[PDB]
Amino acid sequence: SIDVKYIGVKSAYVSYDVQKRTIYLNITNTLNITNNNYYSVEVENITAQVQFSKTVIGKARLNNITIIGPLDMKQIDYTVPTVIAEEMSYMYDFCTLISIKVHNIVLMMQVTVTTTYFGHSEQISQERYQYVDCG
Amino acid sequence: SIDVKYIGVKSAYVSYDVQKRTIYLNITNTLNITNNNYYSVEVENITAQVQFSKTVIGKARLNNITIIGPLDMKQIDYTVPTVIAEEMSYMYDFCTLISIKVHNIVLMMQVTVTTTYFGHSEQISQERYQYVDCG
Amino acid sequence: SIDVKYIGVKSAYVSYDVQKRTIYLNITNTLNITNNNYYSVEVENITAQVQFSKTVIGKARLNNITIIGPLDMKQIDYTVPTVIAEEMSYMYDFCTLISIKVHNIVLMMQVTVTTTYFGHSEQISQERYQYVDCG
């Protein structure tokens, strides 16, 4: 990939930005741009390509075979009891979080037992992230 | 990929923006642009392509064979009991959250037992994310 | 990859930006730009390519065979009990967080038992991240 950008506030090719309480006076601005972009990208020129898979089983004897793909999750436990007991008392809770297995982004690609792949594969994340703000 | 951008506030090719309480006077702005973009992208030129899969089973004996794909989840347990007991007391809760297995974006592509693939695959995420904000 | 940039605030090719309480007077700005970009990227020129897979089982005897892919999670336990006991007392909680297995970005590509791959694979992450902010 090409030209992958995170810009926090402002993007220009040419900028003349005049901001705050300023005097901007008698200004002559002249601009003469030639800006051409030529892309030959992710391009393929092939006579033959072959993706061949063969399984042969002859006079074989097969017992108790297990094939298990990735991210097998077995007998996982989360135990998060919360207890408040009060007498003659005050609780003030502000912005209190209990957070279990919270996800923002999950991107999964070609997650398999078996893969035969030819060509291009791509993942991009661009992000402003804030979990907690309070005040 | 090409030209993948995250811009926080403003994007322009040429910008003459004037913001606040400013004086802009007698200004002469002149602009002459040539800006051409030429794209030959993800182009394919192929004479032959073959995706062959063959399974042959002769006088074989097969018993107890298990093929399990990815992300298999078994007997997972979440226990999150919340208990509040109060007498002659005061509870003030503001912005209190209990969050279990919360997802924003889940993208899954080519998640399989077996795969034969030729070409292009792509995942893009662009995001402004705030989980909690309070005051 | 090419031209992957993280810019915290402002991006320009040319900038004439005027900020705060300034006097900008009689300025003559003249600009002549020639800026052409030529990209021949991720380009392929091949006569033959072969992805061949063959499995042959003869007069063989197979028993108790287990094949397990990556990220296998078994009997994981999270125990996070929170207990507050109060009598004749005051509790003030501000911005209190309990966070268990919280994920932002999860990018997974080609996670497999077996893989045959030809070509390009790419992962890009650009991020402004704040977990907690409070006052």
Curated annotation (Swiss-Prot), chains A, B, C:
Glycan attachment sites: N26, N32, N45, N64
Domain of life: Eukaryota
Protein name: Transmembrane protein 106B
Full-length numbering of the shown residues: 120 to 254 of 274
Location relative to the cell: Late endosome membrane; Lysosome membrane; Cell membrane
Underlying gene: TMEM106B
Top-level taxonomy: Eukaryota, Metazoa, Chordata, Craniata, Vertebrata
Complex formation: Can form homomers. Interacts (via N-terminus) with MAP6 (via C-terminus). Interacts (via C-terminus) with the vacuolar-type ATPase subunit ATP6AP1. Interacts (via N-terminus) with AP2M1 and CLTC. Interacts with TMEM106C. (Microbial infection) Interacts with SARS coronavirus-2/SARS-CoV-2 spike protein (via RBD domain).
Tissue/organ expression: Expressed in the brain, including in the frontal cortex (at protein level). Expressed in lung epithelial cells.
Family: Belongs to the TMEM106 family.
General function of this protein: In neurons, involved in the transport of late endosomes/lysosomes. May be involved in dendrite morphogenesis and maintenance by regulating lysosomal trafficking. May act as a molecular brake for retrograde transport of late endosomes/lysosomes, possibly via its interaction with MAP6. In motoneurons, may mediate the axonal transport of lysosomes and axonal sorting at the initial segment. (Microbial infection) Plays a role in human coronavirus SARS-CoV-2 infection, but not in common cold coronaviruses HCoV-229E and HCoV-OC43 infections. Involved in ACE2-independent SARS-CoV-2 cell entry. Required for post-endocytic stage of virus entry, facilitates spike-mediated membrane fusion. Virus attachment and endocytosis can also be mediated by other cell surface receptors.
Disulfide bridge partners, by residue number: C95-C134
UniProt topological domain (Lumenal) ranges: 1-135
Disease / disorder: Frontotemporal dementia 2: A form of dementia characterized by pathologic finding of frontotemporal lobar degeneration, presenile dementia with behavioral changes, deterioration of cognitive capacities and loss of memory. Gestural apraxia, parkinsonism, visual loss, and visual hallucinations are present in 25 to 40% of patients.
